[PDB]
Amino acid sequence: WGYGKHNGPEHWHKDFPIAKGERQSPVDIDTHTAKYDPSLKPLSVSYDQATSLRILNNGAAFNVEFDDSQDKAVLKGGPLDGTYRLIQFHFHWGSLDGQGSEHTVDKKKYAAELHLVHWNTKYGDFGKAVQQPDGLAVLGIFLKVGSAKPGLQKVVDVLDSIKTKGKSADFTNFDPRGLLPESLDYWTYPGSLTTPPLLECVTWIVLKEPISVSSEQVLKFRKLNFNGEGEPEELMVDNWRPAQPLKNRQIKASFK
């Protein structure tokens, strides 16, 4: 599976029939159809004890991985029951600034999208959590191109050391608080992983406020490779799944 003509999102259903399921992600967020939900509790993003370990090119994106062996960086509140532990973050991005996000907002595509992936600690590990309908919570954050994001630059600067699939580097002492916008206003709906195996285990929390990154920052994302070392070079661009049918879902807003 991949993002090309012969193996991209329109082919995934053959190996992963849940691609045509009832709660697939991403979706278009129709802001006028979403409803404010007073039942939502305040969202709690507690990342001050986060322990990053490594950065990995997995051939689909690059993942910044965390030590999730203790409750050190967690998401709670909002639509969530219980505590969800941060395991990794990654991005999806475009070949041009006009596309790259997975979710869309009134059909608007952003240049990129950040996914902070968390698992529900009552299931003990990530692998058990993805067997559960409420196993995961993904915090999604849009990126637009304008001013640089200072807290992204450490990520940008290490990308040259993980150019190709299967390469990793030490990535300790990175603070993901530097990737968050001012506001935690959000939309939320039930969905799925956006790459194979496309499992329907995710409570999505998508922030309304994008972060701004510079053109030079996103240009460095686009210098990564989908291929392995010594293989013909295929730039890692347009690694996003388009919007999927909303089906029997409602999107709730935390803000009126």
- For Zn ion, the binding residues (CB under 5 A) are 115, 194
- Shortest Cβ distance from residue 169 to Hg ion (Å)? 31
Residue among 25 and 124 whose Cβ is closer to Zn ion: 25
Among 61, 162, 201, 213, binds Hg ion (CB under 5 A): 201
Q: How far is the CB of 134 from Zn ion (least distance, A)?
A: 18
Nearer to Hg ion, 1 or 126 (CB): 126
Q: Segment contacting Hg ion (CB under 5 A): 104-112, 159-167, 197-205, 225-233?
A: 197-205
Q: Of 34 and 116, which has the nearer Cβ to Zn ion?
A: 116
Separation between Cα atoms, residue 163 and residue 172, nearest integer Å: 19
**Residue 115's binding partner, choosing from Hg ion, Zn ion, none, with beta-carbon cut-off 5 to 8 A by kind?**
Zn ion
* Nearer residue to Hg ion within complex by CB, 133 or 245: 133
Q: Which is nearer to Zn ion, 120 or 194 (CB)?
A: 194
Which residue lies nearer to Hg ion by CB, 128 or 177? 128
DSSP for the chain, please give it: --SSTTTSTTTGGGT-GGGGSSS-S--EE-TTTSEE-TTPPPEEEE-TT--EEEEEE-SSSEEEEE--SSSSSEEEETT-SS-EEEEEEEEEE-SSTT---SSEETTBPPSEEEEEEEEEGGGSSHHHHTTSTT-EEEEEEEEEESS--GGGHHHHHHGGGG-STT-EEE--S--GGGG--S---EEEEEE--SSTT--S-EEEEEESSPEEE-HHHHHHHTT-BSSPTTSPP-B-----PPP----S---EES--
Among Zn ion, Hg ion, none, what does residue 25 contact (CB within 5–8 Å per kind)?
none
165 binds, options Hg ion, Zn ion, none, Cβ within 5 to 8 A by partner type: none
Smallest separation, CB 132 to Hg ion (Å): 5
Q: How far is the CB of 200 from Hg ion (least distance, A)?
A: 5
Task: Candidates 19-27, 38-46, 166-174, 193-201: pick the segment binding Hg ion (CB under 5 A).
Answer: 193-201
Taken in order 149, 152, 157, 162, the sign of the CA dihedral is negative
Residue ranges that bind Hg ion, judged by CB under 5 A: 199, 201
